[PDB]
Amino acid sequence: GAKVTVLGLGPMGAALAGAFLAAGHRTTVWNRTPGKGGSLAGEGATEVASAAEAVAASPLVVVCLATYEAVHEVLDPLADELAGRTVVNLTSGSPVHARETANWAQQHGAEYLDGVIMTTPSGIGKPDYLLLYSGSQAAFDGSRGTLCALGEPMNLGTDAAMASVYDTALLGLMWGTLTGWLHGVALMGADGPGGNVTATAFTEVANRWMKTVGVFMNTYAPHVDAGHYPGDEFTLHLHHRTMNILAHASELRGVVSGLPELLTELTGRAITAGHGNDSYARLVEFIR
Amino acid sequence: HMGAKVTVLGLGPMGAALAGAFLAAGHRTTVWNRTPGKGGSLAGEGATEVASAAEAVAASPLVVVCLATYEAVHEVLDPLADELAGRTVVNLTSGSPVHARETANWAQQHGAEYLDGVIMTTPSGIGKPDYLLLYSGSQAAFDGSRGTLCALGEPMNLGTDAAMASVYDTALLGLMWGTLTGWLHGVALMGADGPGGNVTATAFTEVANRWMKTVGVFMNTYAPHVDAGHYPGDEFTLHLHHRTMNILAHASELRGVVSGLPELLTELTGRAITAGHGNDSYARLVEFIR
Ligand SMILES: NC(=O)c1ccc[n+]([C@@H]2O[C@H](COP(=O)([O-])OP(=O)(O)OC[C@H]3O[C@@H](n4cnc5c(N)ncnc54)[C@H](OP(=O)(O)O)[C@@H]3O)[C@@H](O)[C@H]2O)c1
Ligand SMILES: NC(=O)c1ccc[n+]([C@@H]2O[C@H](COP(=O)([O-])OP(=O)(O)OC[C@H]3O[C@@H](n4cnc5c(N)ncnc54)[C@H](OP(=O)(O)O)[C@@H]3O)[C@@H](O)[C@H]2O)c1
Ligand SMILES: [Cl-]
Ligand SMILES: [Cl-]
Ligand SMILES: [Cl-]
Ligand SMILES: [Cl-]
Ligand SMILES: [Cl-]
């Protein structure tokens, strides 16, 4: 039942407004171009003609525009009106622009939370999908109950630029996974003994296996932070040997992704450096 | 419910772990190893060690094999063709799909029920219900021995073709390495100097492990695309993948993260977009690696 304003009714901003309405919040919306708020008004939103009216309507102002340049074009004329309000900026952009906007919000007495949306418009308001936030802890703690309407909120910490970096790092993790998955699908689907398996059958097993892969990540993160990489029962020597088997199996079955060559070159450099007994986490030193 | 009689051939670190887990579950376990003197601890845990593989095979209706190579499997099993008739052989040696099939065919010629398997953990993970063992081959063997095999870990029946487990192992390891390398790349990006950086690997990984639920949703969404040969892009097209991969490439260069992953990703999506599939899903890329 809290008052919340959304600035920006593009596909994503309209979805945020819709999710706020579905949670029962008193939702005021504004967009630069008229005529994009009729469906939302039918669901109980109040559309207003100016950003100044929209900002004045709610103590919590959620911004979702195309660029950070657009954020300041809209909000800098309203600097005096933002004192004491909370600004949650879900616009995507660079870490430096997040930091510059946080500094600007601080200068004007607005509590500033920068965020990133880890889904597409249709995922907003649904379970499991993440929104990541960084900046004012008071803003996060005071707004979390309302922000929950959009998806699962995570507070990354106090530095407003964190969300931008996390988004890029998490997409890289997603692409590494999805590419290893595509490689596996193509291996399973290929003609050959034990092949001609569908992607759906493979993925049913893969989804179980990903539980084990997640434990590996949880085991290896403290190795990176300690700078100590004990290899235990799965050393880089064994990674490299088995990667060579993957390379050979892939070549036989006609799967050409670049992944095996990337993996063997990287592990090979760490082994040449004498770290063959270490965990996969030692490889962070060979990409950084 | 009722304890079984099982034989393990092979007392290397994995084979000895398998035998220990059968014992822990209450099974009457007979063990043999080519080299004597590796079954000491197992005997005190209740195993019966015998001197020859022939004695070991004759001791149990279920014969679990875990040797260094399929060459070794052949050297041990070939003189025992007659002795295997009517027994179930579960071969957890790692090896090639063709070697699994050839062993399967030999076992069938001699009247043994043959199940080939792969162990998706290391010796210390055996005997825990959270790690996977994948099996393929005789469904009669799997159904009849599943209760016993549960002692080792969670068993999964991949199907009737004995060679499948070998292929799944390699494919799942590739998936693991793609994930772990994307994770390493992300750890490096988060740890680097810069606004929003100097974040610990542990902090990053706390968020990453929540995010992996979403990544799994993508794999479950995209598998039917591959099987149908139809790749609707919907709200995440290859155009958008390519655009955001370029951001990743730029961010990584600025922070000195050099993993080769951004170049692999941009080149692959680039080929599909040049081919005219920019509006399709990530699943369309299967056609550009096979
Ligand atoms: N859609 C996604 O998949 C997704 C996922 C995660 C994050 N995001 C982020 O969410 C934000 C919104 O994306 P989107 O889907 O809504 O489409 P968008 O094209 O990125 O942004 C459209 C919105 O920005 C407004 N805008 C652009 N320039 C403006 C300016 N100079 N002054 C005032 N308003 C301006 C548009 O107003 P008009 O209607 O008047 O043109 C519209 O409301 C982006 O930063 C995007 O990167 C999107
Ligand atoms: N360890 C793991 O992390 C892991 C994970 C998944 C799968 N696996 C698979 O498990 C199997 C065994 O691995 P392991 O850890 O036990 O060590 P291993 O070195 O791969 O195999 C050692 C065992 O093989 C026996 N062996 C080797 N050559 C033989 C021959 N010509 N004739 C008879 N026996 C022979 C050795 O007997 P002796 O003692 O007399 O030399 C010993 O019992 C391998 O196929 C491995 O790939 C292992
Ligand atoms: Cl309120
Ligand atoms: Cl107010
Ligand atoms: Cl395929
Ligand atoms: Cl018997
Ligand atoms: Cl061999």
Residue numbers in the entry:
A (entry chain A): 2 to 289
B (entry chain B): 0 to 289
What does the paper say about this structure?
RedE, an IRED, serves as a biosynthetic enzyme in the formation of the indolocarbazole natural product reductasporine. RedE resembles the canonical IRED fold with an N-terminal NADPH-binding Rossmann domain and a C-terminal helical bundle mediating homodimerization. Here, we present crystal structures of RedE, including apo, NADP+-bound and two ternary complexes with AFA and NADP(H). These crystal structures reveal an unexpected secondary indolocarbazole binding site adjoined to the primary active site, and site-directed mutagenesis shows both are critical for catalysis.
Datasets from crystals of RedE grown with 10 mM NADP+ produce Fo–Fc electron density omit maps that can be unambiguously modelled as NADP+. The backbone N-H of A67 hydrogen bonds with the adenosine furan oxygen, while the S83 side chain and L66 backbone carbonyl and interact with the C2ʹ- and C3ʹ-hydroxyl of the nicotinamide riboside, respectively.
